Symmetry: C2
Subunit: 46 residues, 2 copies
């Protein structure tokens, strides 16, 4: 069967500049785990 699984969006992968925030989810018709990523920036690098 299918049991829903979605993680929280991660902290930004980099402490300065552009990094990624990542989660995983099976919220799709095949109920398979996939990754999602979004750009993030905590602060600019000096």
């Amino acid at each position: 069967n299918c049991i829903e699984q979605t993680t929280e969006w991660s902290a930004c992968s980099k402490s300065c500049g552009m990094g990624l925030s990542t989660r995983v989810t099976n919220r799709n018709l095949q109920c398979e785990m996939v990754k999602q990523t979004r750009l993030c920036m905590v602060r600019p690098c000096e």
Copy 2:
């Protein structure tokens, strides 16, 4: 010297189910080309 460049979102990497669509952009403080990715679904699979 920075010339803005953002490509078109690509066709979905898979013909059914969850695939990925990608583009590249330098819209960031370093003016560096970075990839962006998004889940896509053309149609459900069998």
